[PDB]
Amino acid sequence: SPAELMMLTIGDVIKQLIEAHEQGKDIDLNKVKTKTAAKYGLSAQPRLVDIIAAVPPQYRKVLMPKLKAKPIRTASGIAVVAVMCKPHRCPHISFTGNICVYCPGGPDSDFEYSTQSYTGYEPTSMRAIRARYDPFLQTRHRIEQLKQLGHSVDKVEFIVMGGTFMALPEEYRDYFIRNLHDALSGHTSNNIYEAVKYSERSLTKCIGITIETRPDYCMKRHLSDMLTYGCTRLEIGVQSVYEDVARDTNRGHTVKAVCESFHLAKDSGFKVVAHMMPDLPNVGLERDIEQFTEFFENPAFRPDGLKLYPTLVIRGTGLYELWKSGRYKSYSPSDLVELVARILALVPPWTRVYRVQRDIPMPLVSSGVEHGNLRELALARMKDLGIQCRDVRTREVGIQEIHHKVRPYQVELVRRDYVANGGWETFLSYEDPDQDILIGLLRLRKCSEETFRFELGGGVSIVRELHVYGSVVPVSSRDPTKFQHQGFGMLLMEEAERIAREEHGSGKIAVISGVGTRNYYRKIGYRLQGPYMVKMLK
Amino acid sequence: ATFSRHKKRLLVVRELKEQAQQAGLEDLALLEALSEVVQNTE
RNA sequence: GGCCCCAUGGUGUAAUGGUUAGCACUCUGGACUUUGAAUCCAGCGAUCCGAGUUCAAAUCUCGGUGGGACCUCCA
Numbered sequence A: 001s002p003a004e005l006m007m008l009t010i011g012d013v014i015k016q017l018i019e020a021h022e023q024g025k026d027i028d029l030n031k032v033k034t035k036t037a038a039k040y041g042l043s044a045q046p047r048l049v050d051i052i053a054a055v056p057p058q059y060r061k062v063l064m065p066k067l068k069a070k071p072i073r074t075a076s077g078i079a080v081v082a083v084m085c086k087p088h089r090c091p092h093i094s095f096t097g098n099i100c101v102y103c104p105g106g107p108d109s110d111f112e113y114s115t116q117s118y119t120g121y122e123p124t125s126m127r128a129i130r131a132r133y134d135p136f137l138q139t140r141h142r143i144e145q146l147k148q149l150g151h152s153v154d155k156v157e158f159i160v161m162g163g164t165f166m167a168l169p170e171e172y173r174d175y176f177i178r179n180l181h182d183a184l185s186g187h188t189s190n191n192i193y194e195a196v197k198y199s200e201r202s203l204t205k206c207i208g209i210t211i212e213t214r215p216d217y218c219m220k221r222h223l224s225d226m227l228t229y230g231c232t233r234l235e236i237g238v239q240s241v242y243e244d245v246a247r248d249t250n251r252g253h254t255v256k257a258v259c260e261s262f263h264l265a266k267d268s269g270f271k272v273v274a275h276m277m278p279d280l281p282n283v284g285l286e287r288d289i290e291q292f293t294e295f296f297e298n299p300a301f302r303p304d305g306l307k308l309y310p311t312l313v314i315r316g317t318g319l320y321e322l323w324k325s326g327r328y329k330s331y332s333p334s335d336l337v338e339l340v341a342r343i344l345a346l347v348p349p350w351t352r353v354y355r356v357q358r359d360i361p362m363p364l365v366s367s368g369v370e371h372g373n374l375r376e377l378a379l380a381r382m383k384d385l386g387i388q389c390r391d392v393r394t395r396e397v398g399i400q401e402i403h404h405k406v407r408p409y410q411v412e413l414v415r416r417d418y419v420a421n422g423g424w425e426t427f428l429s430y431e432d433p434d435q436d437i438l439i440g441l442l443r444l445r446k447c448s449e450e451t452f453r454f455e456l457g458g459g460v461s462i463v464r465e466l467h468v469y470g471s472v473v474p475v476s477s478r479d480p481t482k483f484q485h486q487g488f489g490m491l492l493m494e495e496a497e498r499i500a501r502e503e504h505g506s507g508k509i510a511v512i513s514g515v516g517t518r519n520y521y522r523k524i525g526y527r528l529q530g531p532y533m534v535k536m537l538k
Numbered sequence B: 001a002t003f004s005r006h007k008k009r010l011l012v013v014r015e016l017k018e019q020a021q022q023a024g025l026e027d028l029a030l031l032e033a034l035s036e037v038v039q040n041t042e
Numbered sequence C: 001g002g003c004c005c006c007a008u009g010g011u012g013u014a015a016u017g018g019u020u021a022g023c024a025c026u027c028u029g030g031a032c033u034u035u036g037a038a039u040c041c042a043g044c045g046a047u048c049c050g051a052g053u054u055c056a057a058a059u060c061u062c063g064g065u066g067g068g069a070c071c072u073c074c075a
Ligand SMILES: CC(=O)SCCNC(=O)CCNC(=O)[C@H](O)C(C)(C)COP(=O)(O)OP(=O)(O)OC[C@H]1O[C@@H](n2cnc3c(N)ncnc32)[C@H](O)[C@@H]1OP(=O)(O)O
Pocket: A077, A078, A155, A205, A207, A232, A464, A465, A466, A467, A468, A469, A475, A476, A477, A484, A485, A486, A487, A488, A489, A490, A491, A512, A513, A514, A516, A517, A519, A520
C-alpha cells in the first residue's frame, strides 16, 4: 500500500538529514526527496508539512531553520491572528431604514450564517463557523496551525473583524476580550482587569489589538473603553473625500465627522488606517486622481495606513439592481491597472499599504475585478512607465529580501516632519539610502490643545509606534543573521526623548503599549500610569 | 582535407553570424579543432 | 541456456543524425496583516550504465543490468 511506502520514505529523509547534521555537511533537500522517492516506487513527492510533523524533539528544535514553509508569515517581525465576532446588524439600520448600497452578506441575506460584509466562503470565515464563533477555540486553532508550519509564535497581534464591534452590548465585549487574553496567557479570569494583569505577567506577549469602527462610534467614551481593552490600532472606512458620494450611497455620516474622529483618535494616541474604494458610482476616471492627490496633500486627511478596495458588484444588493438596469458600468481592466499604478505612485514614504484588493471568490462576482494578483501587475506596469513605489511595506528588509536579493550595507538615520490633523508629526527611521531599504521606525506627536485624557494634559508628548522589521527573534535570544535584537530600539527612544524636551518643550513623555512592551519600557526606565507608560523629562 | 573542411565550415559559420549581425557556438569548436590540426601537423 | 523486443523529470507519456528535449499528475514560492489545502501568475526537475562508427548520436553497431514473449535445463 502507498501509505507505508510514504512513511518509510519520510523516515529515510529525516534519517539522511539528521546524519548530515551530525557529521556537519550541507544537503540539498529536493534531490534527496526525489532520489528517496525513486527507491520505494512512488508516483508522488513528499510534502514539507509531513516532513516537519515527524522529527524527533531535539532534532525538531535544531533543524527547523531548514524545513520552514511560507517564510512570509513571519517576515515582518510579528505573528498575526485574525478572529471574528458574532453576527449582528449594523447600527444605522434603524434611523435610515437600510444599510450601505454595496455591502454583501449579513444577518438578513442569502449567505447563511455569515457576518456582515463577508460571504462565509473566506478562509477566516470558515474557521470561525466550525468553531461556532468562540474566541478561545479560534485563537488556539490558529496558533496550532502557525506552529505546525514551523514558525515562532513568541510575539502575537490580534485582528478583530466582523461588523461594528463597538455597537454590541458591554457584556459580550467583556467576554470576548477577556477570553482572548486568557487564551494567550492561560489564566481563567472574571473581568477585563484581572485578565490584563495576568497577561502583563505572561510569557506569550500580546503586542496589540486592532478594531474596525465607524466614525460615529469613535468618541471620548468609546476611545476610553478601547484604551482599557489594550487596543492600539483603528480601522475606519472613509471610501471617498466627496460629500455627495457619502450621502448617495446611504453611508449614514459625513466627511467632517471623519476628520473630527481622526483628530480625536490621533490626539488620544492611536494609529489610523483608512479604507478607500475606487470606481464608486458618479465618480469618473478623472475624479479618482484628484481624490487621492487631495487625500495625500491636504493636512486634514493624511492617514498612517491605506487599504485599496476596488468596487465589486455582488448579488442581493442595491448596486446589483443598478447594474442590471444598465446604469452602472465598471472600468476596463487596462484602465484599472493604469489607475492603480498611478495611485500607488503617489503614496508618501511614511504610509504603509496593507492590502490592495478584496478576497471574494471569483464565481460570486458579477462584474469588476476578475484576476487575483492586481498588486504585482500594477508593479510591473509601474516599472514599464518609469515610476517607483516608495511605501513602507515594499521597502522593509524582509520584503526586499524575499522579492529581491539585497541586504543593507550603509545604514543611516532619517527624520521627516509634517503637519496632520492639527498636530505636529515627526517620523524617525533607520534606513539604507542607496538601495532604499527600511529597518526600523518610530512615530512621535506633540499633543494639541484639545486633548481630553487626564494623563496627557499639561505638556505631554506621546509616542505612537515603535517597530523594527526582519524575521522574528524570540525574547531573550539573539541571532546575528537577523535584525531585531541589535540595539535599534534604544537608539530610537533616546532620540525621541531629546526632541520632546529640547524642541517640543514638554515635561513628560508617554507611550501607548501592549503588555510585553510594558515590561520592555519598564526595563528602559518608564513607570505605569493609567493605561500609559510615562516618564518625567525635567 | 580535414584542415580544408573545418576551415570552410568555420568560414560558413562566420559568414552566417556576420549576416545575422548586419541583419540584427560552433565557431569556437571549429577554431579549436583547426588549432589541434595545425599542432599535429607541426 | 539459448532465443525476439522494451528502458527519457518522482509518475503517464511527445521528438526526424544540427549548431543545444515539449506536454500532463505531483512539488515549491508570491499576490496575503482575511489562506499549508482554493484562484491567478511564475519556478525547480530527465535522454540507465560501457565501448564506439559518422564532422557530428537520446537516435545507428556491439556489449552488461533489469523487464516482457518460447521451451527451458534443472532438481
Ligand atoms: C510598544 C509597541 O507599540 S510595540 C513594539 C513593537 N512590537 C514588536 O514586538 C514587533 C517587533 N518589535 C521589536 O523589534 C522589539 O520588540 C522592540 C521594538 C520592542 C525593541 O526592538 P529591538 O531593537 O529588538 O530592542 P533592543 O535590541 O534595543 O532590546 C533588546 C532587549 O529587549 C528585550 N525585549 C524585546 N522585546 C521584548 C518584549 N516584548 N518584552 C520584554 N523584553 C523584550 C530582549 O529580550 C532584549 O533584552 P536582553 O537582550 O537584554 O535580554
